[PDB]
Homo-oligomer: A and B are copies of this chain.
């Protein structure tokens, strides 16, 4: 059975978490929330409470068949980790071409992999310039698939994003 790592801090955009989680589980994949501390709670912009399953200190990225990075201000929080542990975690996925899915601000974390040169991505407007400075070919599309990396811009893109992430996992 395949399972998806979802990296999550406080102030995630609630629907960026719930909608792809529901699509993945509906297709028969399981999800696991990876955050600062196992069994801590993180709270979305709009109040959704999510319990962290696995601490980032213990998490083995090779255990997971895909990474999902929900947006809002969760990715900014994750990039505040003094030891850069979420960037290092995401680097496993980009270095080994494992399916990697990011929506909205999510692609911010991919910048910390230093692996984006020549990759094609989209993101929320706020973050596109940073993605291009990181070496990406940034485009403005509802969903972008570049081999293993799937990106979308906003919650309104979720139908397209969810369809593509489940396909990539079927591979």
Q: How large is the interface on A (under 10, 10 to 19, 20 to 34, 35 or more residues)?
A: 10 to 19
A124 to B134, CA, bound (A): 18
Contacts of A80 in B (CB 8 A): 124-126
Partner of A76, one of B76, B111, B134: B76
From residue 126 to 148 of chain A, which have CB atoms closer than 8 A to chain B? 126-127, 129-130, 133-135
CB <8 Å contact, B125 and A111: no
From residue 29 to 84 of chain A, which have CB atoms closer than 8 A to chain B? 73, 76-77, 79-80, 82
- Residue ID in chain B nearest A73 by CB atoms: B73
Q: Does A157 contact B (CB under 8 A)?
A: no
Q: Does A112 contact B (CB under 8 A)?
A: yes
A141 to B79, CA, bound (A): 19
A10 to B138, CA, bound (A): 27
